[PDB]
Paper text:
Interestingly, seven Fabs (2523, 2533, 2578, 2585, 2586, 2595, and 2596) competed with known antibodies from both Sites 1 and 2, suggesting that these sites may not be completely disparate but linked in one large immunogenic face, here termed the “bridging” epitope. 2586 binds directly in between Sites 1 and 2, with HCDR3 and κCDR3 each overlapping a portion of both sites. 2586 has an epitope on Pfs25 nearly identical to 2587, despite a slightly different competition profile. This difference is explained by a slightly different angle of approach, resulting in the 2586 κCDR3 partially impeding access to Site 1. Epitopes distant from Site 1 are associated with substantially lower SMFA activity (1245, IC80 = 263 µg/mL; 2586, IC80 = 96 µg/mL). The human mAbs reported here bind a broader range of epitopes, including epitopes that bridge Sites 1 and 2, and another distinct epitope termed Site 3.
Numbering used by the authors:
A (entry chain C): 2 to 164, 169 to 172
B (entry chain L): 5 to 213
C (entry chain H): 1 to 141, 147 to 229
């Protein structure tokens, strides 16, 4: 599980209504829950096992000629050209994303919502109810405070400063 | 939401108004300043941050289910009513408001209220009506809590109380009326008017004659 | 600059209906949520309801005290907010504020939900009371001082004028402001602090004049 003390390798912590996760920088993809690395452009023989997308690596296909494709890791499946957990294949949240219930030994998909939205019990726990979510991110950098950007929380520059660093 | 009905500080002191509630641990708390005869104004949002145009003396802090509004070096310009708000998304969306706090910037020594309690007159009782008049005057700051007691028991219904109004001597006065039936008056042994001002409570008692 | 101008307030009898309006200007009205907040005379703020923008399907939500009776409407093409009030109770009489909800993002949805802009408000009165003269009752009387007064009870509308001894007695007189009962009628008291020994010798007459109803009452306050 990802907490406020997790170090996002080549990434940064973001917070939604029900969990935290690591978002990568620029064109980096998630190797695991907290590590971001460069992705390959084409799945070659040389790029086998190298990451091609979020939670996906290039593999070899023992076909009639050798073939290479970008397959999601174990426990993930491809939905809209994005690898999401297998238990989230048919869980749509609307104003949010599907995550695994960390407080349940059996893998179950639940809806984590954008900032300002909470799971609506009257809409199959989808993200269709107004509701604030207090930010718990530790933004300790020079003039960095928690800011809501693109439906998520993130440590950004204080209002009136721009990036080397915030000033 | 729960907040104290009245606070009082001397000029230059650091005022603090607390707002408590279980919904304060889930969603943010917002403070509004309302001066007499004017619209409310947001002064503190997201527990601790201040909007643009608010002086730096306004600030807040959050500790669990209690949020404290802080005003460092209170000016007489800051004397107003303060309401804390939040929200509850447990069921349908609900905006939550506190009771409100009358912040008084002290400008004179604290005056204790002078209380006078009148029993129902004989003419009114002969009209099948009974009214107890509890008059409160010459108290500062202009904030008070009135409670009625029927034979040392709390009275809920039948109570009409005014808000404090500024007197000529810049003190405040208020009124509190207890409506009863003549049977209710002549049955109990006594009736009391309890006027609590700045922690101290003044009590007056009348009995049928 | 932002402006929220309320309109439609007035006096209506209990059980009747009334519609409020709010003309907005100085901002994109269709982007924001709009709320109604009322405040009884001398009491705290109370939330009425909320209507949402097109991005949130114009959905509504109200408080339990006005559920089913009040209805919030909006006309984005006219920059107007409305409040249809039905089955009005005396508890509904208050000053109603037109409020804009701030804290939205670039998506039409909000990150936070606060009330950044308030209006001047419009006053709504709910009472079935008409013109009525008061019923004056006497208030009979340590420190060597006593107190006697006159009870000006159940009158409408404001104001009344109370003099003592036809204006001859002015020192020590304190006429308290009136109270507004749930029935809609006003009531006040006017007391005078007098020396205890003068109760048996000096006469105390209170003169109540109610110009709206053309009622003049003189009452003698005697000790007992």
């Amino acid at each position: 599980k990802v907490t406020v003390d997790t170090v996002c390798k080549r990434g940064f912590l973001i917070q939604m209504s029900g969990h935290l996760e690591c978002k990568c920088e620029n064109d980096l993809v998630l190797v695991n829950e907290e590590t971001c690395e460069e992705k390959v452009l084409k799945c070659d023989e040389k790029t086998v096992n190298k990451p091609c997308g979020d939670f996906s690596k290039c593999i070899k296909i023992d076909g009639n000629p050798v073939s290479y494709a970008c397959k999601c890791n174990l426990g993930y499946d491809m939905v809209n050209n994005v690898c999401i957990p297998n238990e989230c294949k048919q869980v749509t949240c609307g104003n949010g994303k599907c995550i695994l219930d960390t407080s349940n030994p059996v893998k179950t998909g639940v809806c984590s919502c954008n900032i300002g939205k909470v799971p609506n019990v009257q809409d199959q726990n989808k993200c269709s109810k107004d509701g604030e979510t207090k930010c718990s991110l530790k933004c300790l950098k020079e003039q960095e405070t928690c800011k809501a950007v693109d439906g998520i929380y993130k440590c950004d520059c204080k209002d009136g400063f721009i990036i080397s660093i915030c000033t | 939401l729960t907040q104290p009905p009245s606070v009082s500080f001397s000029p230059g002191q650091t005022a603090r108004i607390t707002c408590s509630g279980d919904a304060l641990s889930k969603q943010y708390t917002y403070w509004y300043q309302q001066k007499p005869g004017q619209a409310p104004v947001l002064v503190i949002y997201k527990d601790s941050e201040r909007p643009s145009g608010i002086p730096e003396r306004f600030s807040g802090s959050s500790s669990g289910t209690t949020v404290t509004l802080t005003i460092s070096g209170v000016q007489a310009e800051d004397e107003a009513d303060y309401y804390c708000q939040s929200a509850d998304s447990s069921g349908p969306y609900q905006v939550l408001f506190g009771g409100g706090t009358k912040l008084t910037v002290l400008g004179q020594p604290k005056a204790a209220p002078s209380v006078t309690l009148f029993p129902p007159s004989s003419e009114e009782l002969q009209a099948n009506k009974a009214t107890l008049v509890c008059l409160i005057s010459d108290f500062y700051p202009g904030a008070v809590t009135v409670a009625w007691k029927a034979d040392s028991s709390p009275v809920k219904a039948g109570v009409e109380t005014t808000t404090p109004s500024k007197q000529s001597n810049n003190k405040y006065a208020a009124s509190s009326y207890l409506s009863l039936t003549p049977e209710q008056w002549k049955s109990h042994r006594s009736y009391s008017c309890q006027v609590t001002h700045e922690g101290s409570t003044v009590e007056k008692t009348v009995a049928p004659t | 600059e932002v402006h929220l101008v309320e309109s439609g307030g007035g006096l209506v009898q209990p059980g009747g209906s009334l519609r409020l309006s709010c003309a907005a200007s100085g901002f994109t009205f269709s982007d924001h949520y709009m709320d109604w907040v009322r405040q009884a005379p001398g009491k705290g703020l109370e939330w009425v309801g909320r209507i949402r923008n097109k991005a949130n399907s114009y959905t509504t939500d109200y408080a339990a005290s006005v559920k089913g009776r009040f209805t919030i409407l909006r006309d984005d093409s006219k920059n107007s907010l409305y409040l249809q009030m039905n089955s009005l109770k005396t508890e509904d009489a208050a000053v109603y504020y037109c409020v804009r909800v701030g804290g939205l993002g670039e998506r039409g949805d909000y990150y936070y939900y606060y009330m950044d802009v308030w209006g001047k408000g419009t006053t709504v009165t709910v009472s079935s009371a008409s013109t009525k003269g008061p019923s004056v009752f006497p208030l009979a009387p340590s420190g060597g001082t006593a107190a006697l007064g006159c009870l000006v009870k159940d009158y409408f509308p404001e104001p009344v004028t109370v003099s003592w001894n036809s204006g001859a007695l002015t020192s020590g007189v304190h006429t308290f402001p009136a109270v507004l009962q749930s029935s809609g009628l006003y009531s006040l008291s006017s007391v005078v602090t007098v020396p205890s020994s003068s109760l048996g010798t000096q006469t105390y007459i209170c003169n109540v004049n109610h110009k709206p109803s053309n009622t003049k009452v003189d009452k003698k306050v005697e000790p007992k």
